[PDB]
Amino acid sequence: PHLGEGGALTGTARKAEEARLRRAEIERQTELGRLQQQIEQRRRRARAQIEA
Amino acid sequence: PHLGEGGALTGTARKAEEARLRRAEIERQTELGRLQQQIEQRRRRARAQIEA
């Protein structure tokens, strides 16, 4: 069986849950990466203001 | 005669005005250099705020 929340193996539902967990981790990775990009650019703004 | 502004002077006046003009050239040099430095640092501030 698929173990975790729901905890049931059913071809259709296991496929859906696996795909959903995969896509959700993808979305989490995208969020984290672009948030780190934004943090870097805010740091750049701050360094520039201190230089000013 | 010391031809130029002031006429001729010729004497202690010659010494005085010649040394005054030399010291004033020194003063002009110092002032223009300090002005260049101020302008460059203001430009640095402008660049940094634009980067921000």
CA distance B44 to chain A (A): 7
Nearest residue to B51 (alpha-carbon basis) of A35, A51, A38: A51
Q: What is the resolution of this structure in A?
A: 3.5
Nearest residue to B41 (alpha-carbon basis) of A52, A48, A44, A49: A52
Set of chain B residues whose Cβ sits within 8 Å of the Cβ of A43: none
Task: Verify whether the Cβ–Cβ distance A48 to B48 is below 8 Å.
Answer: yes
Provide the experimental method for this PDB entry: X-ray
Task: Verify whether the Cβ–Cβ distance B49 to A49 is below 8 Å.
Answer: yes
CB B46 within 8 A of CB B38: no
Q: Where are the alpha helices (DSSP H) in chain A?
A: 11-51
Instruction: Tell me if chain B has a CB within 8 Å of the CB of A43.
Output: no
